[PDB]
């Protein structure tokens, strides 16, 4: 199983680096499911944009497609940080 | 703090590289000869990382670097004589 990792916690509006340990065997694949579904990333160090804190534990699945060989299904979890509420400042009339 | 650290493995043109935050093999933080680690704190100022050059069908020893993270000076609260 290729060792998996990702960046630390990401604020909404920021993108997440997603990572597969360097396995110089073949092509890489990432999927949003634990299953093989909608490839979101196909490389060792892809970046996913558009993640929300509405799904803050976003789990991704890892498969290093070696030559004529498929590795196990590793999994990273991306921690997406909620954006603080907008501020409505004011002042004393002067 | 706020600056990133270059981390390094001597060039070993054999295979892939791996870095881990433990002395053991845990959460690969870097997988190359010259990766950069962001987000380190002086709260853990002697931050030790472990080094493994994964050659072809071969794994090397476990080398270790120590990153020295410098505490950020306190904020300054300047003032002036009323004028």
Would you give an account of this structure?
The PDB classes it as cell adhesion. Keywords: ixotrophy, type 9 secretion system, surface protein. CryoEM structure of the neck (1403-2314) in the grappling hook protein A (GhpA) in the bacterium Aureispira sp. CCB-QB1. Chains A, B are The grappling hook protein A in the bacterium Aureispira sp. CCB-QB1. Organism of A, B: Aureispira sp. CCB-QB1. Method: cryo-EM, 3.8 Å. The structure is cut from a larger assembly and holds two copies of chain A. Chain A has 94 residues and is mostly beta strands. Chain A contains no helices and eight strands. Chain A has strands at residues 4-6, 10-11, 16-20, 27-31, 47-48, 57-66, 69-70, 74-81. In chain A, the strands form two sheets. In chain A, strands 2, 4, 6, 7 and 8 form a five-stranded mixed sheet that branches. In chain A, strands 1-3-5 form a three-stranded antiparallel sheet, with no helix packed on it. In chain A, strand 6 and strand 7 form a beta hairpin. The termini of chain A are far apart. The interface between A and B is small, with 10 and 12 residues.
Shape verdict of chain A: elongated
The succession of helices and strands of chain A, N to C, reads EEEEEEEE
- Put simply, the count of helices of chain A is 0
By DSSP, the count of extended strands of chain A is: 8
PDB class: cell adhesion
Keywords: ixotrophy, type 9 secretion system, cryoEM, surface protein, predation, cell adhesion
Entry title: CryoEM structure of the neck (1403-2314) in the grappling hook protein A (GhpA) in the bacterium Aureispira sp. CCB-QB1
Chains A, B: The grappling hook protein A in the bacterium Aureispira sp. CCB-QB1
């Amino acid at each position: 199983a290729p060792m998996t990792s990702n960046s630390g916690p990401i604020c909404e509006g920021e993108d997440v680096t997603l990572m597969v340990n360097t396995v110089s065997s073949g092509t890489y694949a990432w999927y949003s499911d634990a299953n093989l579904t909608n490839l979101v990333a196909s490389t060792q160090n892809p970046v996913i944009s558009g993640l929300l804190a509405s799904n803050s534990p976003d789990t991704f699945y890892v498969q290093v497609s070696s030559n004529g060989c498929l590795s196990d299904t590793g999994f990273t979890v991306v921690q997406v940080n909620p954006n603080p509420a907008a501020v409505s400042p004011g002042y004393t009339p002067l």
